[PDB]
């Protein structure tokens, strides 16, 4: 039933501190209910109740507390949590951080209201994602393959072409209808236009929804921006059977809003001063993915994050690492050499590749090829590190073949055009024509049956 009871409105602001405003005399505060604030000048803001205690409600104000006042500020308590109007009508539209429209279209008519927090998908109803998506990118489809409904982030150093990679996935991704949710947090306008323009250049724009929060929009709205995106993705996938892909852009600029809120609340700090709940907060984003029984929908997530000081062990990538189905890494050591897309296969993995490949999904050889490509690429890096100290005169002929493998591999397997789509089969054949650099017996990861069917060609 609808909430029929008339809304209260309080002037009883009794403190303000950082992004918090503390009400008093509140009649039965509800934890996590939303409050609208009117400032003395008639400006409207919104905020969530973070704590309640007897008559007190601690409200965090999304649009910042600057201009909140202890006498004239009016808080309309809405009486419920942060619901969002959702509809399939949100495809082909663009929204601000808090889900207000910015494409000059009207306010969304709700086909329903959903709780922004979503719900924990029941582990019994969840279906283990296995139907492969070809992204078209050899460094993915060959060695890091993505299942329909996987969650797998793209990690990057700063300034790397990770935007162009995500754009290419949103230009080439498909199975062996489809729709995209896109969200960006703390993005610069010089990149917001790139994403919006790319969905026009790909012709895709009619099947995609962009939630944009820019670096000069309010930082606390970034907390809800990816949650709005996921709530829309749940409506499209689980209510409407759409094969949804969710792009979350700079989870780092989201994580910085967590660190800010944490410091402002005085929460117990984990590594680098992120809140203790950092893992759970990231899970509350990243777990809304994968198929569920009876529903043909399948939320896939490709978060993107700039790793601070390029450090893989930083809390943002590292906690994301524990949650996601493996990770795709983009590297300066490739990008400086103009090797687009600069995806370094070696540190990458996909947890679901194990079941997304082989007969009925991909050619029989694929799993064996992937492992042997890791083996040779890795040994190539090891002999390169040897050559950099002791010179090529210390290397055996086989060690020089592993060095040549790494060179030929990066120039052919990883190197691909920004608009070039390669099938998995073409990627595997490039894999084999590189593996043929060694004698058949040297391919120690591959069984003799696979070698007899696929090595000689």
């Amino acid at each position: 039933n609808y909430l029929s009871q008339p809304r209260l409105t309080y002037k009883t602001v009794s403190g303000v501190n950082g992004p918090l405003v503390i009400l008093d005399h509140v009649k039965f505060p509800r934890y996590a209910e939303i409050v609208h604030l009117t400032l003395p000048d008639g400006t409207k803001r919104s905020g969530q109740v973070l704590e309640v205690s007897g008559s007190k409600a601690v409200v965090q104000v999304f649009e910042g507390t600057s201009g909140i006042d202890a006498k004239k500020t009016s808080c309309e308590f809405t009486g419920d949590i942060l619901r969002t109007p959702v509809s399939e009508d949100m495809l082909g539209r663009v929204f601000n951080g808090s889900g207000k429209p910015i494409d000059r279209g009207p306010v969304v008519l709700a086909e329903d209201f959903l709780d922004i927090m979503g719900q924990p998908i029941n582990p019994q109803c969840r279906i283990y994602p296995e139907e492969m998506i070809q992204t078209g990118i050899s460094a993915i489809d060959g060695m890091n393959s993505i299942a329909r409904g996987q969650k797998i982030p793209i990690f990057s150093a700063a300034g790397l072409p990770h935007n162009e990679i995500a754009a290419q996935i949103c230009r080439q991704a498909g199975l062996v209808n489809f729709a995209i949710v896109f969200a960006a947090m703390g993005v610069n306008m010089e990149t917001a236009r790139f994403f919006k323009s790319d969905f026009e250049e790909n012709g895709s724009m009619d099947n995609v929804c962009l939630f944009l929060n820019l670096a000069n929009d309010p930082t606390i709205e970034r907390i809800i921006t990816p949650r709005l995106a996921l709530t829309t993705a749940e409506f499209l996938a689980y209510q409407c059977e759409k094969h949804v892909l969710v792009i979350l852009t700079d989870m780092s600029s989201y994580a910085e809003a967590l660190r800010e809120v944490s410091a402002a609340r005085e929460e117990v700090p984990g590594r680098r001063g992120f809140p203790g709940y950092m893992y759970t907060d990231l899970a509350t984003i990243y777990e809304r993915a994968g198929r569920v029984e009876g529903r043909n929908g399948s939320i896939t997530q490709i978060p993107i994050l700039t790793m601070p000081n390029d450090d893989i062990t930083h809390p943002i990538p590292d906690l994301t690492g524990y949650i996601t189905e493996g990770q795709i890494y983009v590297d300066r050591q490739l990008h400086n050499r103009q090797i687009y897309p600069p995806i370094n296969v070696l540190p990458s993995l996909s947890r679901l590749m194990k079941s997304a490949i082989g007969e009925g999904m991909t050619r029989k050889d694929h799993a064996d090829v992937s492992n042997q490509l890791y083996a040779c690429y890795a040994i190539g890096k090891d002999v390169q590190a040897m050559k950099a100290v002791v010179g090529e005169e210390a290397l055996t002929s086989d060690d020089l073949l592993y060095l040549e493998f790494l060179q030929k591999f990066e120039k052919n397997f990883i190197t691909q055009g920004p608009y070039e789509n390669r099938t998995v089969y073409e990627t595997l054949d490039i894999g084999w024509q590189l593996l043929r650099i060694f004698p058949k017996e040297m391919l120690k990861r591959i069984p003799q049956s696979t070698l007899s069917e696929f090595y000689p060609r």
Partner: protein, 602 residues
């Protein structure tokens, strides 16, 4: 007195409640009109602070808070096996059935066991009216599964004399199966007992551990063995393989039942288990059967409410102790004690308590200590004698991938086995990624009697394996400053057999049909051949380097390249296609081929 107080305040997973005079600390309490489940963490006057095992978003000041007297407790009985439960014991299959939802609703109260199922009960026949009986006495079997006979037993707090025992027949969780009397007071029981998860289920004795916890992985079972009744940790960074070890133990081990505990884990893990385990099969007595019949999952996915991670771990061990009391060699996969410690960080943060290292509460080391030490091999309670055991394996997940982590630092002080995973091996896709330099097992001195009885050749091989694998790293620190030309022939042989033992013994692709599992006979056969090559190659050099007719590693490789290729090929032997005698005969032919080749070099 009032049965309920009222929510005085809320902050994330913490709810304060007024009018709670006479509450007990760690009492289980319902919160809110929707009847959320929680537990009292602190008392502060006529007022209480409750950790809530569901998300509190939506709770209001002045909502009812209903006491229950009972501490956090689990229903134990028939119909546990094959099920999946959340951290507060709700059976997910029945939630799915009753709600038809994709998600677990807030406020669900579904009974922990399916009280509608008539189970087949077989009373012990030894009991009769007037007989004396005590906690842990098996009053009857229930034929729960084709594998696991459930052995119902008197609750450990209970004692008395048999007033009534039910005849052989079909009964459920509400049917009275037994009635006692003690001190003139009668006590009825159904087939379901209830136990406080924070209280250890007692035993007659905790014995030493002395039978290997057989595991599919070569490197584990050979070089760092776990033992039935022993603890273990698998500290590893993200993507290191610790979860696949945890799967592999559950899929393939000599454990009579497995409790798997998905504490704060990624949701697709539970789906993968529930996808794979009904389809994978063991065999008993000439009947092939689905391994799910010997498991239960406690799940609490990473996005489920933080507090329930604590209740999940305590549920997983309390179930494990229940099956231990039946005499089963239980195993229990504590699938991340760091994500558990992070839940203790959360409650401590809300309570405003003083943190130890990295925000963790000071009692973290004490909670972990009093958890892993619930393992053991035990003389059970009660009269028919049983030797059950719990073996606990904890997938610690160090923040930043660094073992200076406080969860690791505490865990290593408690566990008798360390399987430290290396991210650099996982990057190379070397798996399982066990670092053989830092890993250790304290059980070797007890297990050496079992190896002496069944595998007398093994202790020499295990020693030579560990030594070669250390000598590799001793050589590497030299080679990286001068180049490989500095090596003596003994050192080249050392690095080569280390490369065999690394790439063809320690390496194991556990999803493939051939690396799926590895029997001990296959494992020792592989290692025996590799070390036989080491000793023979070393002997050949030592025999001939006293002369100008000196054998070298290159001479051996050029004469014996096929033998190196055969040695590498040993891993591909498949237990489904090849019998133990067939694999052993192939390995004997490798020993003979090596001997005849070396006899031609010398």
């Amino acid at each position: 007195e009032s049965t309920f107080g009222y929510v005085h305040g809320v902050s994330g997973p913490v709810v304060t409640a007024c009018d709670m005079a006479g509450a007990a600390m760690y009492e289980l309490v319902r919160v809110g009109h929707s009847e959320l489940v929680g537990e009292i963490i602190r008392l502060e006057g006529d007022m209480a602070t409750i950790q809530v095992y569901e998300e509190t978003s939506g709770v209001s000041v002045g909502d009812p808070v209903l006491r229950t007297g009972k501490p956090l407790s689990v229903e134990l009985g028939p119909g546990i096996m094959g099920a999946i439960f959340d951290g507060i014991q709700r059976p997910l299959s029945d939630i799915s059935s009753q709600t038809q939802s994709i998600y677990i609703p807030r406020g669900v109260n579904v009974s922990a066991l399916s009280r509608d199922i008539k189970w087949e009960f077989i009373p012990s026949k030894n009991l009769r009216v007037g007989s004396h009986i005590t906690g842990g006495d098996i009053y009857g079997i229930v034929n729960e599964n084709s594998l696991i006979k459930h052995k119902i037993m008197l609750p450990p707090r209970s004692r008395g004399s048999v007033t009534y025992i039910a005849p052989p027949g079909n009964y459920d969780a509400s049917d009275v199966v037994l009635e006692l009397e003690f001190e003139g007071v009668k006590e009825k029981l159904s087939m379901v007992q209830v136990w406080p998860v924070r209280q250890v289920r007692p035993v007659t004795e905790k014995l030493p551990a002395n039978h290997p916890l057989l595991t599919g992985q070569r490197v584990l079972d050979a070089l760092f063995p776990c033992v039935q009744g022993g603890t273990t940790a698998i500290p590893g960074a993200f993507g290191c393989g610790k979860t696949v070890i945890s799967q592999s133990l559950s899929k393939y081990s000599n454990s009579d039942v497995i409790i798997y505990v998905g504490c704060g884990e990624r949701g697709n893990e539970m789906s993968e288990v529930l996808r794979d385990f009904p389809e994978l099969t063991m065999e008993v007595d000439g009947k092939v059967e689905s391994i799910m019949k010997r498991t239960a999952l406690v799940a609490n996915t990473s996005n489920m409410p933080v507090a329930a991670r604590e209740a999940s771990i305590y549920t997983g061990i309390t179930l494990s102790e229940y099956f231990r009391d039946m005499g089963y060699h239980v195993s229990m996969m504590a699938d991340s004690t760091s994500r558990w410690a992070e839940a203790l960080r959360e409650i401590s943060g809300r309570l405003a308590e003083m943190p130890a290292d990295s925000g963790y509460p000071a009692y973290l080391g004490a909670r972990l200590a009093s958890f892993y030490e619930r393992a053991g091999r035990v003389k059970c309670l009660g009269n028919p004698e049983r030797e059950g055991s719990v073996s606990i394996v904890g997938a610690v997940s160090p923040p930043g991938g660094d073992f200076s982590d406080p969860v690791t630092s505490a865990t290593l002080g408690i566990v008798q086995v360390f399987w430290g995973l290396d991210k650099k091996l996982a990057q190379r896709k070397h798996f399982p990624s066990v670092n053989w330099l830092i890993s250790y097992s304290k059980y070797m001195r007890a297990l050496d009697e079992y190896y002496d009885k069944h595998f007398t050749e093994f202790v020499p091989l295990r020693t030579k394996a560990k030594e070669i694998l250390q000598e590799e790293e001793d050589l590497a620190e030299i080679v990286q400053l001068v180049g490989k030309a500095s090596l003596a022939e003994t050192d080249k042989i050392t690095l080569e057999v280390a490369k065999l033992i690394k790439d063809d013994f320690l390496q194991q692709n556990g999803y493939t049909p051939y690396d799926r599992f590895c029997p001990f006979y296959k494992t020792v056969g592989m290692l025996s051949n590799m070390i036989s090559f080491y000793d023979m190659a070393r002997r050949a050099v030592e025999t001939t380097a006293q002369s100008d007719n000196k054998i070298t590693w290159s001479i051996i490789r050029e004469h014996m390249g096929e033998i190196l290729y055969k040695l590498s090929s040993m891993k591909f032997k498949d237990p489904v296609k090849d019998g133990e005698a067939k694999i052993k005969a192939d390995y004997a032919q490798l020993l003979e081929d090596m001997q005849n080749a070396f006899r031609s070099l010398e």
